[PDB]
Design an enzyme around this catalytic site. Structure first.
Site: not given
Ligand SMILES: CC(=O)N[C@@H]1[C@@H](O)[C@H](O[C@@H]2O[C@H](CO)[C@@H](O[C@@H]3O[C@H](CO)[C@@H](O)[C@H](O)[C@H]3NC(C)=O)[C@H](O)[C@H]2NC(C)=O)[C@@H](CO)O[C@H]1O
Length: 129
Positions: A35, A46, A48, A50, A52, A59, A101
């Protein structure tokens, strides 16, 4: 901070990630490697809108607030910058909520594509733990 392999393994263990939700330590070290290359200051944007953040590439659409991700959640209740610190506590605490989650470590795309189903114990070889 750019962690050494064994150095990160020890910090993660210390922070209670070894076998957290059934994921052995090697899984967490493997995910961090792919990562962020073990760099706490890594950031990637990203499509969209957003971003990271940190060693675990958490995110902003869901977990932290960066002030520029319109209508996103801040499930870990922290500013995204907190995730770039040399101290991994915030990242680890937020990671524990993510993995709980519902999707497990599949929330980490690099884990799913380069760690999942491999011999992850190799990531902790030679470390004093
Ligand atoms: C490390 C990281 O930040 N990874 C990001 C992923 O978390 C994110 O995936 C989406 O994450 C959310 C939150 O966990 C997922 O929603 C959950 O979905 C399960 C069912 O699959 C449900 O039980 C939960 O209630 C629900 N949580 C909430 C808070 O609603 C969502 O399914 C994930 N989306 C996808 C496509 O996998 C991805 C995508 O935004 O980004 C990663 O960076």
């Amino acid at each position: 901070k750019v962690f050494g392999r064994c150095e990160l393994a020890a910090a993660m263990k210390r922070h209670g990630l070894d076998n957290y939700r059934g994921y052995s330590l090697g899984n967490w070290v493997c995910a961090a490697k792919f990562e962020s290359n073990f760099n706490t200051q890594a950031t990637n944007r990203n499509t969209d809108g957003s971003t990271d953040y940190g060693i675990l590439q958490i995110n902003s659409r869901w977990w932290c607030n960066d002030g520029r991700t319109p209508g996103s959640r801040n499930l870990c209740n922290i500013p995204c910058s907190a995730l770039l610190s040399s101290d991994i506590t915030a990242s680890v605490n937020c990671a524990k909520k993510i993995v709980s989650d519902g999707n497990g470590m599949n929330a980490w795309v690099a884990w799913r594509n380069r760690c999942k189903g491999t011999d992850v114990q190799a990531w902790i070889r030679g470390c004093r733990l």
